[PDB]
Every structure is written in structure tokens, then in C-alpha cells.
Write a protein that binds this ligand. Structure first.
Ligand SMILES: Nc1nc2c(ncn2[C@@H]2O[C@H](COP(=O)(O)OP(=O)(O)OP(=O)(O)O)[C@@H](O)[C@H]2O)c(=O)[nH]1
Ligand SMILES: Nc1nc2c(ncn2[C@@H]2O[C@H](COP(=O)(O)OP(=O)(O)OP(=O)(O)O)[C@@H](O)[C@H]2O)c(=O)[nH]1
Ligand SMILES: Nc1nc2c(ncn2[C@@H]2O[C@H](COP(=O)(O)OP(=O)(O)O)[C@@H](O)[C@H]2O)c(=O)[nH]1
Ligand SMILES: Nc1nc2c(ncn2[C@@H]2O[C@H](COP(=O)(O)OP(=O)(O)O)[C@@H](O)[C@H]2O)c(=O)[nH]1
Ligand SMILES: [Mg+2]
Lengths: 430, 427, 68, 427, 429
């Protein structure tokens, strides 16, 4: 049986994770206590006499995000041991989450994962959720991904990670932690999907016409991507794309494993009725820079490998027509050596909508996960931020005192520079 | 007594084969529960070609469903006509091919190919005489393209005197459903040019044009396309299952349609297709079926037959038809455009008639074409493969399961050899 | 279930087997020729009239004069 | 057993031809669905001339309906006798000609002429061998003129010995239904003098006063006006579709009515026109059918036949009548009117008697007149074209798609050479 | 499938479009909430299940006119993002609507025109609604018509412009904005249709006997003419006259394309019972000098070409008869090189009536859109007023403040002078 395990590290992983497990419960009919009044095996383990528990662990050094889950309305869903807490947070220090504090909790963390990896009959991958800007996300995320590769080799690590915005970011030391996390994320995860905070702000302001959005509006449509990602494991479809099919069909080289995301129909209740939602209409909007979920312009780079996951009432011909019209549009550009560039997956289940959510029901939906050379713009802009503060050794004495050495910033800069150089040559026309 | 063993591989072939047994069991009169409920006696002489007698009057298909994912097992099993297959013949994997040709052929197929050769040997030993192995798969995938071609080499070595009917869809020109089609197809065709006795080239986009330009269906699902593919496969063995005025089995088609041992890929068309608005107006006669037969839009392959010369074509006519009226229509198409026909092969076309038509439709025909116009299809895969291979894109996967790049140069060399001999005979 | 059961045409066996006259009248299905309607309609000058005088309100019979 | 392919073009052609298939269907006993309901066997021997036999007794007409604005075909599809035509024959455009001749001849007629020739060629060998081709259009238009004449030029290119019978509506003398009537008519005539064989010149303003004065109709409309033209097109092929005492097909009228190859424009009259109130008063006899035939008021061309001499006349009588009553009444009109007939051709009038009259008529006849009096209509069209071309009015649209001003001079010369040649034989 | 995409620019365009889309929903039976309780495909798009949206955009830099639609009875009809607004208006400055405040809204405007054209299968034309005497109608209309040419090539554009009235005016810089706007719409608009307030208000005073008319009464009868212009696409008839007809049957040269307009039955409810509306009567009444939309005199010039679009119960006999009688009248004279003077067209359905409107239910209708040599009279008067205006640079520092160069004023003066010498030359015998 198909089966995936999600580890959620750091506050951003938990707060998104509070929204993803709110989505799968409404989708599969599981009540907050954990009892339904066959497809649930992808995310839920059926426990004993009619109870389903999630296959996720919640680990964070700061308990104050975790105890909202323990005392919330989903207190009876999760196993009590799966919600893992610590004494004090890493507190925006990568040296504290990887060396000082993270070493005590990572030994316990692999123990509960080994319980979930023993309960599976066929394991298909891992779903990491973290933010590279924080100490827990960068530090404990690097340590957990390091130990997972040694323990469970050649398994797919689908790490949905959140990166700082080029313009609108909240933490000062975010450029430092992003570079040190990328040095470990580059060589370990199989598919890493960037999420950007500011791009989702522009999505909610324009398409969802909400002038003042907060984090719980942001994490709902992030959870719409994850449900659209794994809908082929839970529900049937015309063209099933398994999680193991993603990494063999998206990454061309072992080092270029960064991809974007875009959810095409994002409309409110009063917008939906006036809008004639057609397959060609949503497909055109998915490639627009407005509906991209990372703050970058895809016209600058060239798309390299894009996969579309059509959810709902979509026949295999209107995806045949829409993809052809997309390829003939002059704005969208593919790389020369990859003439086949599209993966079309259709799942027959329409997307579920949460009451209180700002999305209305839509019969058809598209999630595009795109490998592009324009991600080099997302990593050069953070390479510029890391260069200025390290030019006079800012904030270094917090990292040096907490276990990490001075030298590790040098090759982390070199490894990120080696990645930007690799991105330019793979987009080079030959 | 000419039995056919059907094996289905991959998501594409199993969904195609689900529609195949949907149509054949409807033709032979078997209901979904497996009992016989037909009204004719002509269906009850040759059931053995596709079915086995079971205790209690149950009819089980000679089908072996093989896959690396349990997802497409559940899709076939939950649809209509899904219970007919044996529960023991539902062999499947758990990890999944992942659209990796090397994982299907070397790593994950190895733990399963021994399990599926147990089933194939079991069914072949049961039937009295093997007339061929009918495998339905794809070439752009990994489950039926990678693991399926391993099954082609395995059956061909313990059974070297039997035909192989590899019904395989090819990557489409207009769109692309995976991204590793040139890597998947070129390696799968490399296995098919030796072991497979003859192959049937299909594609999605030629079915879409038939469903839209000819049948005028606005919303064609995969069930609409697979029924067009299943209408082919009933027409290939039409003379085997039913009595006919001029019989033609799978070897007689093979000895005529294949002049040379590497030219065994064919482009196939099913003739009597009309829209619901045009059923009452189209007067179906033998000249009318022949006019639709050689039309380029009725081909279920992307190759336009106007570009290449027809080395050998064969006609599988089904129904009560006048014999010369069948033949003089094929003589008319030989001479009204003789430049489209090969000069050094006189009498290119072959006509065979069966007096039992498919249900509801009194006149029908199936076109099999060994035209050199299909060199453009393999030329497209060759130029798509050479573009990716020089930059080594999507290659760190395939070298990971023990499939080195030495084999991939050999795939391109054998790909170019196939198109070289097709272009050699245009002159 | 997919969109096919929502559209209404189930399995294309009618189109393949050419037995469409058994169906109830008006079944468009997914046929582009059948689901075509446009340009409106309006009687105009065809009211209470037809061309029959060749085959044997109008004419000189509708000529009037003075009361007798 | 002789077959005619009908092609209708534009708003004028489609609406006329819809009434053309209206009359011939109930004349042959065809219901709106297509079944046979006639009470005599005489209708059914000659059905392949205009219809193709379909399964279930359906009869699809040999009509190709073609245009550039799709709103016209929704009118024939919604009308009565609108469900008979084949939907493959329903070939259409989307943009519309817009009454520009060169736009309907070069830009959007180019993509459509490939489609209509595929339909017509498929209808060509569907029969044994064509008697000829019949088209209906209007010379002042842009859809039936620009695209119809290129259709005529190509169909003569591939079928040179086959016949052409164009029923063309010429522009008005008194009024203007489109402002670009003289531009369209002059370019249409320049094509039609070579490729077309017979051009039945019909004008609206001669149809209107027939409805108003001879037929006394208070409210004539296009439903009434097209039915007069439809009664003609049934009368020309009366001997083709029915046995007759003295038969006349298209080639019978071709060799008689045409003295010289450039002169093939005819004025046409339909004989038994009588209002409803005068029905009982008129006696139907052969002498008074002839007297109504030779009147200038009865001609459906605005040219007055008194001003010119009749080069050749042909009258197609239908019904149970004696063959001398048609004869000495043709001797009487040549003797009592000798100045209006040509001295260098003795016995100008050609006769034909058909045994089957139309529906509801005991006797009927149709007149074809090849006279030199039609030159004043062409000179009138030539006069308006000279007035506009010198100041190049309404002309940058025709040069917007590359048709240079040279072709207008070529059209005027071919118009002026033709109007002088009629005057040359008038002397 | 036929489709026309209407655009309404400026306050004059929107308020006419409020009356235009009121008439369209009444013809096809569309309820104001957006749902009917095949013929609608030229103006409305069947959205999902049981909902129709107009194929139009109301764009204006002043938000006051746009939100009246958004608060009115048709708030549920239009798509909420099809309606376009702005922060500050152009305010009678052609330089503002073209250069400094109209540029920021035209990028969003074509993004909806792109999506509306992608929703339609075969586009037949564009309908443009403005008045050249204002800022947004002239400035942003110049930006929209020019940018639609480079994007939507060889597509017909009907320009329904309301020109400044000769005797009365509502603004002082109207001669300035009219000359500059005519410089832009001369080269770009495929067919231009002239409207004038005084002649329409003279129509209401004589035939409709409304001594105190307003914009609501004026916009309805303009909307009735435009619905008759596209009635051939909406409904079938004898001689259908689609959009490309008016392009080539009314415009002889690539400069002479400013046409008049006339609607023959303009009769109130109580006058209609006593009036026998015959085609011979209304065709005579269509060409009357009191019945045009523009205050220019017919007999001062000669007609180039005339288009009689007929609606309702009209047989093709009497249009043949009445046009011949029109030609024989010596009061009107045509140009010497166009003996074929007319183009005719008949639709088979009568016009609908707005409930509460002034127009009566008439069984017949004429849309008399004619090309004349008398269009130079309304152009020379605007040319003369601008010449006196520009004599010592009145109201120029406002225009040159917002980016426009002083040389653009004299260039537009030469263009109308080029147009002025065109009409005298072409109409000369
Ligand atoms: N999309 C999204 N991003 C969030 C959310 N919460 C926090 N973030 C992002 O996370 C960043 C802070 O880094 P984190 O990894 O969350 O910090 P942390 O998880 O508390 O780790 P420690 O500080 O070491 O305890 C912020 O800049 C946000 O952009 C959330 O709810 N949704
Ligand atoms: N046809 C018609 N014209 C109107 C109407 N209302 C105002 N107008 C005319 O519009 C002219 C003003 O020019 P416009 O372009 O409309 O002014 P505007 O649209 O408000 O442009 P801005 O002031 O820059 O926002 C006036 O001279 C009026 O004659 C109306 O309801 N119908
Ligand atoms: N005709 C047809 N083709 C299909 C169907 N499902 C998938 N395919 C084709 O299969 C190809 C994808 O390969 P895949 O199904 O993944 O092959 P696998 O990996 O061997 O299972 C695409 O080109 C599809 O067009 C179907 O139901 N009918
Ligand atoms: N008799 C008759 N003439 C028609 C009809 N429709 C159009 N016409 C004539 O056709 C001429 C113009 O035809 P038009 O519509 O421009 O042709 P098109 O646009 O090229 O297809 C006019 O002079 C009309 O008199 C009809 O139904 N009956
Ligand atoms: Mg924290």
C-alpha cells in the first residue's frame, strides 16, 4: 500500500502543518476526534477499533507552537508522542539547531520515525516542511535530513521549504541561515519546492481580493498544493503520477532539484460565479507570473521540466489542447535540449474547500510544479544579502560560540556560488 | 485450436486491455459475471482463442495483468468487466516503476519477472496450441515500456516459434505526457526490433483527431480512445475467432506484411467510424469503407501515409461482402494513386474477408499498413533523443540502476538503423 | 467517477456499433453537429402566407371600392 | 442515370437553393425526413440525378452548401426541408466575405476552397459520371461572387469536359442592394466568360414586377421570389429526371443556345404565371403558354428583348401536349415577329416536350433566351464601373488583399469586348 | 458563432452603455440578476450553468460613474473586475487622458480585452463608445483605439463618437479636445459614427414632444440605433448585413469614414395609434433633415452612400420601390460617380421597448447610416473654433503642462485641414 510520512520542523512547518492536516481530515471524512462516521492509508494509519491517526511527527524546540496543537480542537487526532517538544528554541541560530540543542532532540526524533517507518508496508517518500530562515527550520531540518538519508537510503524527500522574500522579510539573520541550510538541503533532499511569503501575499491581494491577509490564509493554499500533489496516491485518475514519478520526471541533474509551484483557480465566492472556468482558462493563468507562488519572474529564465496535476472534471483532450496553446505562446520559453517538457496528470477528485477558507468550490484545478532557470534569480538575490553582512563578519559571534566554527560560512558561500554557476550553464543554449 | 495469450503491462496497456476485454466479451456474449448469455451459436465454437473453460460455466480470459503499481490494478478491478480475470493472475509490485525504464528493466522488474514467467508458463502450458503472445503496453512509460520489454525477451527465448503482437502506443507529436519519452521509447524500440515478431504503432493524438474530426465527439475520455484501440485488436484475430470466406491468421498477416525482418512496425486503422449526426446519412457499402480506409485521417498513427510509400498493406474485412467488390476497390486504390505504392513490390495490398461482422455493424474492416511513412515517427524520437543525450539530461537516474550510457548509444545506433533502411527503400 | 458519467454518454458502444436509432430522440451527447444552435429566429413576413398560386389577403381579389 | 452536383454560395445562393431543393423534393415525393411518399412509380427511376440513396430509404441531396458567414447556413438548417443535406456537405466559414470580391477570392476563400473541393471531389466519383455541375449565386455579392467564381474556375480545371450551369443574380438597374454591385459584377463576368458554360442571367427587378403586375402579389418577398427561380431550375432538367416525347438534357441545350463561345448569357422566363383571382378565367392551352412566354414582361432579366434580336431561343415544355401545338406556335412567333429574330439563323427556336408536368400543373414550360438585347444590361453595369474606376471609389478594399488595379482594366476590357461582340452580331 | 466586444470609454460612453446594455438584456430576455428564466452569443457569454455576463468593459478614470453601475440594479450582471475605475479623472485634458494619467490604466484594460477575445471563438468587431469633447473620452479613447490596432489587426471597429454641438456646449475646451481626438480616430477607427447632442435634442422636441429632455432620454434612442446596427448578427432575416458590410459599403476612401445616423420611427405612445407607419413613409422620414443625429445639413452636400437597415415586418418589395422613389426626389442629390447609391438590409424582428421609455412599440424600423459630403460642415466649424482658440494660445498651458508638446496642436490643425480639403475635393464633380 502507498504510504507517506510528513515531518514538520519549525514554526512555519507546524503552522502550515496545522492547515494541511485540517485539509486531509475534511477530504477523507475524518472528524477531529479521529473517527469516520480505503484511501486514507496514504496519510492515516487505522488504529485498532475505528480510529485513524496521522503519519506525521511535530518537532520543534519551542513548545509554544506545539502546545496549541495539544490544547486545540485537534487534540485527539495526533499521537501524543508524535508531537515532540523541547525546552528552549534555537532562536534564529543555525548553530543552536544543528549543534547545540538539536543534538539532544534528534535522537528522540528518529525513534518515532522508525516506529512509523516500521508500520508501513510500502513507503513512498517523506514530506519535509520547514523554513530556512529560522534556527529550528535550518538547524534541526539539516540534522533530521542528514540522519534520514543514512537510515533510509534512496527514498524521496519532498521538502516543501519556505524561503525569505527579496523585499518583504521579517527576520534579520534570515540570509545567514538560508545559506547554511542550502549547503545541506542541496545534497540531501530529492525535490525541494520553494514557497515565498510575499508571492502568496500578492496572490491573496489580487486574486482573492483580501486586503489584509495573515498566516492562516497563507497556509491554506499552501496546503492546497500538498493535497494536489498527493491526490494521485489517494484517488484514482486518468493519468496517475506517483510521488516516485516526480523526481524521475522533474530533476535533470542531481544538483538542480529546486522547483516552483502554482495553483491555477484561486477565486473567491462572488468571483467564481461570474467567471466561466474553463480548462484553457486556468491553464493560461497557471503560467502567469501573478499566480506563481515564489516571487520571481519566469520570463527571465527558461522552464526546464513542468508537471501539471489536473484535479477534477478534466478530460484528457482539453489538456491536449491547452498544452499546445501554451507551447505556441511566445512568452513561455523552454530549454533547447528538452523538447518534451510537460507532464500531464489528471485526478478525478475535485478539490475540497474548508468552511471559513477564502477559496470557493471549483470543478477543475491545476497545480504546476516547474523546474526553471529563473530560480537562479531567487538564489543570487539571497547570495547578495549574505555577502554584505559577512563582508564585516556581522552576527558571527552567536554562531561561533554555539558550536559551529568560523570556516563553515566560507564553503556554504562557495556551495551556493557553485549552484548559481551550475544554473547558468544548464540554461545555456547549445 | 489457435489460442492467444494476452498479457497487459503498465498503466496504459492495462487500461487499454480493460477496454479490450470490455469489447471482446461483449462480442462473444460473456456478461460481467462470466457466464454465457449470447444469442448466437457462432460465438460458441471458438471461445478458446481468448478464454478458458472453468468449472460451472464460468469463462475466464487468457489475461495476465502485470504491473509495478497497485493503483492501476484497482482501476481495472473496480470498473465493469473487471471481475472476469483470475485472482492469481493479478501479479503486481509495490514500489512502482516511477517512469524509470531502468527500474522497470533491471532493478524492480528483476524481483517480478520470475513471478510473471511463472504465470505466463502456466497459461501457455494449459492451452493446446500457442498461436501468439498478445502484449498490450506503452513506450513512453516505465511500467509497461521498461518491464514489458523484459517480458518480450523472456517469452521469446523459451518460445521461439510463436508470434508476438506488441500493441504499443508511441509518444505524440502535439503534446507529451511524461518528460522521458525519448529516453523511454528509444530503449524500448531497441528491444522490440529483434524479439517482437511484429508491432502495432498507436498514439493518442491520432485517436483524438478521429474522435473529433470524424466521430465529432467534443469530449473524448480515455475510454473513448481505448475503445478505438480495442476495435483494432478484435479485427486482427477476426479470422481466428469466427469462420470466414477467406481466412487469415496472425502468421499469414506476418508473412505478408513483413518483407524484411526489421520492418515489422505497422500503422493501423479502423474503418467504419461516423458521427451520430451522420449515421442516418452515410450509406455504408464496400466502396464507402474503402474510401475511408486509405484516408490519412483514419490512421491511428501520426505518420501521414502520403509522405511514404506503402511497402505492404493488408485488409481485414469483416462481414457479408462480395469478394470482387472487396478486391476491385483495393485494385482501384492501387492504380488511382500508384506513386504512393512501392513499385518493386507488385500487388502490395492483401484482402481477407470474414463473414461474421462485429455486433450492430454489418460491414467493417481493419487496415494494417507497413508503410515507410512511419520513419518520421522514429526520426522524431531519434532527434528528441539526441538533443537530450548530448547534454546528459535526465540521465543520473538511468545510470543509477546499473544501466550505463554504453547501452544508450546502442539504442540511438539501432534507432538510426531502423530509419536508415526505411529511407533506403523510398528510392 | 470521472466526468464521463457527468456528461452522460457512457461507453461509445452506440457510436461504434452504429445502432443510434434505438436511442431516444434528442440525445445530443457530445456531438458538435447536434449541439449547434444560433442566429435566433423570427417570423417577419411569412405570417399567414405561402406560395401556392403557381401550383393552383393578396392579389387583386383584395381590392375594395365603394359601398353598394 | 445522369447526375448533377449542386453548389450553393452566399446568402443569395443558399436561400435560393433551399427553395430549389424545396420544389424538387415534393416533386419527387420526398418528405422533410427523406423517405418516399409519392403515389406513382415515375418519380423513382430518376432519383440519383439529385439524390444519393442511404440506408433506411433516406435520400440525401447532391448539394454542397458553402459560404463564408456562418449565419446563412443556420437559416437553411432551421428551415423546412433543412434536415436533408449531409453534414459533411455543410462547409462553412466564420468571418464572412463582407461583400468584397477579392476578400472572398484571395484571403478567406483560399483556406475554404481546399475544403469544398474535397467535398465536391468525393461527391464526384460517388456517382457514375457527371452530366454536369449546377451552381447558384449572385454576381453583385461577395460571398457567392468572389468565392463562387473561383470555385467555377477550379472545377473546370479538374473537370474540363463536364458541364456548368450557373444561375446568377445580376445587379439591379434601378436600385442598389449593395453599393459595390458594379465592382462585383464586372469581376464576376470576367471570370464567367471563360470557365462557365451557361449563365442563366436573372435579375431581381424583373422578378419583382412579375410578382406585382403579372402575379398581382401585394406583398412579394424572398420566399416568393426564390420560388420563381426554383421553378426555373426544375424546368431546365425536366427531361433529365423524367421521360419525354422529345428529350433535352444540358448538352442538348448547350449546342443549340450557343452560336459562339463567348456568347452564353441567357434571359429566362417561366410561363404559366397567373394570379389567384384569374385562375379560373385563363384557359390552359399551348397557344397561350407561348403567348405568355414571348412577352417582355415575362422575362426574369431586366433587359428588354424588344431592343435586340433573339440569336437563339429554347423552350422546355412539360405536360401532356401534342408535338405540333408546340411546333406551329413556334412557327407563328418567327413569322409574325421576323424583325426581332436573327436572319442569319433560320428556325431560331428550339423545342422540347416532357411528359411529366410539375406538381399541380396540367401544363408548364420554361423559356431560355439567348438574345443580343442583354448587352444593354451589361453596358449599364459597364457604365457604372467606368464612373467609379476613374476616381477609384470604394476600391482600396479590393487592393487591400493584393488584387491590383490592372485586373479592373482587364475586367472592363473583357466586359467591353463582350458588349461590343453582342453589338457586332446585332448588325 | 458571432461575437462583438463593446468597449465604453468615458462618462458619455458609460451612460449610453447603461442604456445600451439595458436594451440588450430586454431583447433576449435576460433578467437583471444574470439568468434567463442561442441568439445571445453576440453579446453575452453563457457562464457555467444559468448565468450570462456582458462582453463589455466600462473603463473611466473617474470612479463616480463606474460605481453607479456597481451600486445600481445591474451590480450582479457585470463581472466585478470587468468594470474598471481610476483614482483621478482626466478632467477635460486630452494630454492627461493620453500621457500622464491614462497610461497607468491602459495596461490593465487590454488584459481584460485579451481574456474576452480568448473566451470568444470568432470575433466580428469592436464597439467603441465615447464623446470627443472630454478628457477620458478623447484621451483614453485615443490610447485604447491605437493600442487595439497593433494588437488586434484588421478587425473592424465601430466608433460611436458624440461630437461637440455647434450652437450649445457643455465645456470650454471642447474645440481643443475634438481636434486632437479626431487626429487619433481618423487613422485608426475602421468605421466612425457621428453623434451630436443638439440634433438628438431637436429630434426629441419635434417628434417625441418632450420639451424638457435629459441624458436618460437621449441615451435610449442612441442605444436603439446601435442595437439595430448589430440586429443582423442577433437575428435572421432576408438581407443580413453584418459588421464587415459597413466597413466596405460606406467607406470609399481610407479617410472619408465619418458617417451620419438616423432612426426613422421616433414616435411616442399616443402618436403611434394615429400614425400609419409604412415603409414608403419612414424612408421618406429617414432622410428628412430634422432626423439626423448630427446638426449638419443634407442638401448643402451630396450623399456618398447610404445604408438602410430595416427591422421588423418589412417585405423586400417596398424597399425596392421606396429607394427608387428616394432617388427620383430632386431635393436630395447624390455624388456623380456613384449611381448605385444604396445598400439595403431587412431583419425579421421588431425592436423591443424599454418599460417606461418614450419610444413606442413599432412594428418597423429604419437605421439610416449614410455617408455624405456634408460632414465637412461640422468639421470646418470645429476647425474654425480651434483656429480662433489657438490665435493667442488660450487654454494651452494646461495641455503642455501634462507632457504634451506644443507642436502637437498645430499638427492636429493640419490634419483636419487635410480632411477639410478632402471633402470639397471628393464631392466636387
Ligand atoms: N507561510 C508561512 N510562513 C511562516 C509561518 N510562520 C512563520 N513563517 C516563516 O518563518 C520565518 C521564521 O522562521 P522559522 O523557521 O519559522 O522560525 P522558527 O520555526 O520559530 O525556528 P526557531 O526560531 O529556531 O524556533 C518567518 O520569516 C516566516 O516567513 C506561517 O505560518 N506560514
Ligand atoms: N450621448 C451622450 N453624451 C453625453 C452624456 N452625458 C454627457 N455626454 C457628453 O459628454 C461630454 C463630456 O465629454 P466626456 O468625454 O464624456 O467627459 P468624461 O467622460 O467625463 O471625461 P472626463 O471628464 O475626463 O472624466 C459632454 O459634452 C456631453 O455632451 C450622455 O448621457 N449621452
Ligand atoms: N490510449 C490510452 N493511452 C493511455 C491511457 N492511459 C495512459 N496512456 C498513455 O500512456 C502514456 C504514459 O505512460 P504510462 O501510463 O505511465 O506507462 P507505464 O509507466 O508503463 O504505466 C501516455 O503517453 C498516455 O498517452 C489510456 O487509458 N488510453
Ligand atoms: N431572389 C433573391 N435574391 C436575393 C436573396 N438574398 C439576396 N438576394 C440578392 O443578392 C444580392 C446581394 O447578394 P449578397 O447578399 O450581397 O450576396 P453575398 O453577400 O455575396 O452572398 C441582392 O441584390 C439581392 O437582391 C433571396 O433570398 N432571394
Ligand atoms: Mg520557534
Amino acid at each position: 500500500m502507498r504510504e507517506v510520512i510528513s515531518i514538520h520542523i519549525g514554526q512555519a512547518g507546524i503552522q502550515v502543518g496545522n492547515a494541511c492536516w485540517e485539509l486531509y481530515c475534511l477530504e477523507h471524512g475524518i472528524q477531529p476526534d479521529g473517527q469516520m462516521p480505503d484511501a486514507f492509508n496514504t496519510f492515516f494509519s487505522e488504529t485498532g477499533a475505528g480510529k485513524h491517526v496521522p503519519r506525521c511527527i511535530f518537532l520543534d524546540l519551542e513548545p509554544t507552537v506545539v502546545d496549541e496543537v495539544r490544547t486545540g480542537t485537534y487534540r485527539q487526532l495526533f499521537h501524543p508522542e508524535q508531537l515532540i517538544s523541547g525546552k528552549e528554541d534555537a532562536a534564529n541560530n543555525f548553530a543552536r539547531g544543528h549543534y547545540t540543542i538539536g543534538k539532544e532532540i534528534v535522537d528522540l526524533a528518529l525513534d518515532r520515525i522508525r516506529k512509523l517507518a516500521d508500520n508501513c508496508t510500502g513507503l513512498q517518500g517523506f514530506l519535509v516542511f520547514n523554513a530556512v530562515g529560522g534556527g529550528t527550520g535550518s538547524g534541526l531540518g539539516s540534522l533530521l535530513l542528514e540522519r534520514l538519508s543514512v537510515d533510509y537510503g534512496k527514498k524521496s524527500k519532498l521538502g516543501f521549504t519556505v524561503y525569505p522574500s527579496p523585499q518583504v522579510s521579517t527576520a534579520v539573520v534570515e540570509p545567514y541561515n538560508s545559506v547554511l541550510s542550502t549547503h545541506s538541503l542541496l545534497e540531501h533532499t530529492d525535490v525541494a519546492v520553494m514557497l515565498d511569503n510575499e508571492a502568496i501575499y500578492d496572490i491573496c491581494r489580487r486574486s482573492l481580493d483580501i486586503e489584509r491577509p495573515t498566516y492562516t490564509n497563507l497556509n491554506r493554499l499552501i496546503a492546497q498544493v500538498i493535497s494536489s500533489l498527493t491526490a494521485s496516491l489517494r484517488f484514482d485518475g486518468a493519468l496517475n503520477v506517483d510521488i516516485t514519478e516526480f523526481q524521475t520526471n522533474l530533476v535533470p541533474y542531481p544538483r538542480i532539484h529546486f522547483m516552483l509551484s502554482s495553483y491555477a483557480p484561486i477565486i473567491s465566492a462572488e468571483k467564481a460565479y461570474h467567471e466561466q472556468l474553463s480548462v484553457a482558462e486556468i491553464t493560461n493563468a497557471a503560467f502567469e507570473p501573478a499566480s506563481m507562488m515564489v516571487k520571481c519572474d519566469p520570463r527571465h529564465g527558461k522552464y526546464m521540466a513542468c508537471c501539471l496535476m489536473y484535479r477534477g472534471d478534466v478530460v484528457p483532450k482539453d489538456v491536449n489542447a491547452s498544452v499546445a496553446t501554451i507551447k505556441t505562446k511566445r512568452t513561455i520559453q523552454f530549454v533547447d535540449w528538452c523538447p518534451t517538457g510537460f507532464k500531464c496528470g489528471i485526478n478525478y477528485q475535485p478539490p475540497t474547500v474548508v468552511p471559513g477558507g477564502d477559496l470557493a468550490k471549483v470543478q477543475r484545478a491545476v497545480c504546476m510544479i516547474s523546474n526553471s532557470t529563473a530560480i537562479g534569480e531567487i538564489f543570487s538575490r539571497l547570495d547578495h544579502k549574505f555577502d554584505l553582512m559577512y563582508a564585516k563578519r556581522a552576527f558571527v559571534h552567536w554562531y561561533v560560540g554555539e558550536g559551529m566554527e568560523e570556516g563553515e560560512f566560507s564553503e556554504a558561500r562557495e556551495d551556493l556560488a557553485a549552484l548559481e554557476k551550475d544554473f547558468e550553464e544548464v540554461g545555456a543554449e547549445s | 485450436m489457435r489460442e492467444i495469450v494476452h498479457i497487459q503491462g503498465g498503466q496504459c496497456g492495462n487500461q487499454i486491455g480493460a477496454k479490450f476485454w470490455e469489447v471482446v466479451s461483449d462480442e462473444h456474449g460473456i456478461d460481467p459475471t462470466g457466464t454465457y448469455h449470447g444469442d448466437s451459436d457462432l460465438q460458441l465454437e471458438r471461445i478458446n482463442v481468448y478464454f478458458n473453460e472453468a468449472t460451472g460455466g464460468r469463462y475466464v480470459p487468457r489475461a495476465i495483468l502485470m504491473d509495478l503499481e497497485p493503483g492501476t490494478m484497482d482501476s481495472v478491478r473496480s470498473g465493469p468487466y473487471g471481475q472476469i480475470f483470475r485472482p492469481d493472475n493479478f501479479v503486481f509490485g509495490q514500489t512502482g516503476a516511477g517512469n524509470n525504464w531502468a527500474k522497470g528493466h533491471y532493478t524492480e522488474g528483476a524481483e517480478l519477472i520470475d513471478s510473471v514467467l511463472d504465470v505466463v508458463r502456466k497459461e501457455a502450458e494449459s492451452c493446446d496450441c500457442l498461436q501468439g503472445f498478445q502484449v498490450c503496453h506503452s513506450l513512453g512509460g516505465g511500467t509497461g515500456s521498461g518491464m514489458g520489454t523484459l517480458l518480450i525477451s523472456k517469452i521469446r527465448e523459451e518460445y521461439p516459434d510463436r508470434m508476438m503482437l506488441t500493441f504499443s502506443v508511441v509518444p505524440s507529436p502535439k503534446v507529451s505526457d511524461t518528460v522521458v519519452e525519448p529516453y523511454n521509447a528509444t530503449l524500448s524500440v531497441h528491444q522490440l526490433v529483434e524479439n517482437a515478431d511484429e508491432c502495432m504503432v498507436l498514439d493518442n493524438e491520432a485517436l483524438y483527431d478521429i474522435c473529433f474530426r470524424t466521430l465529432k465527439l467534443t469530449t473524448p475520455t480515455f475510454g473513448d480512445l481505448n475503445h478505438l484501440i480495442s476495435a483494432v485488436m478484435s479485427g486482427i484475430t477476426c479470422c481466428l475467432r469466427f469462420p470466414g470466406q477467406l481466412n487469415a491468421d496472425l502468421r499469414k498477416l506476418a508473412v505478408n506484411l513483413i518483407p524484411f525482418p526489421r520492418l515489422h512496425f505497422f500503422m493501423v486503422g479502423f474503418t467504419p467510424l461516423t458521427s451520430r449526426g451522420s449515421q442516418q446519412y452515410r450509406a455504408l457499402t464496400v466502396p464507402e469503407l474503402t474510401q475511408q480506409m486509405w484516408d490519412a485521417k483514419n490512421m491511428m498513427c501520426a505518420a501521414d501515409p502520403r509522405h511514404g510509400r506503402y511497402l505492404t498493406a493488408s485488409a481485414l474485412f469483416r462481414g457479408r461482402m462480395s469478394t470482387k467488390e472487396v478486391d476491385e476497390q483495393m485494385l482501384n486504390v492501387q492504380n488511382k494513386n500508384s506513386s504512393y505504392f512501392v513499385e518493386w513490390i507488385p500487388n502490395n495490398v492483401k484482402s481477407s474477408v470474414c463473414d461474421i461482422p462485429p455486433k450492430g455493424l454489418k460491414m467493417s474492416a481493419t487496415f494494417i499498413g507497413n508503410s515507410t511513412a512511419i520513419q518520421e515517427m522514429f526520426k522524431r524520437v531519434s532527434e528528441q533523443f539526441t538533443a537530450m543525450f548530448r547534454r546528459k539530461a535526465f540521465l543520473h537516474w538511468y545510470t543509477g540502476e546499473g544501466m550505463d550510457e554504453m547501452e544508450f548509444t546502442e539504442a540511438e545506433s539501432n534507432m538510426n538503423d531502423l530509419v536508415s533502411e526505411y529511407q533506403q527503400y523510398q528510392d | 467517477p470521472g466526468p464521463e458519467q457527468r456528461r452522460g454518454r457512457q461507453d461509445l458502444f452506440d457510436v461504434v456499433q452504429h445502432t443510434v436509432h434505438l436511442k431516444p430522440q434528442g440525445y445530443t451527447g457530445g456531438d458538435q453537429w447536434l449541439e449547434h444552435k444560433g442566429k435566433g429566429n423570427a417570423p417577419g413576413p411569412e405570417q399567414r402566407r405561402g406560395r401556392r398560386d403557381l401550383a393552383d389577403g393578396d392579389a387583386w381579389l383584395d381590392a375594395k371600392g365603394k359601398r353598394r
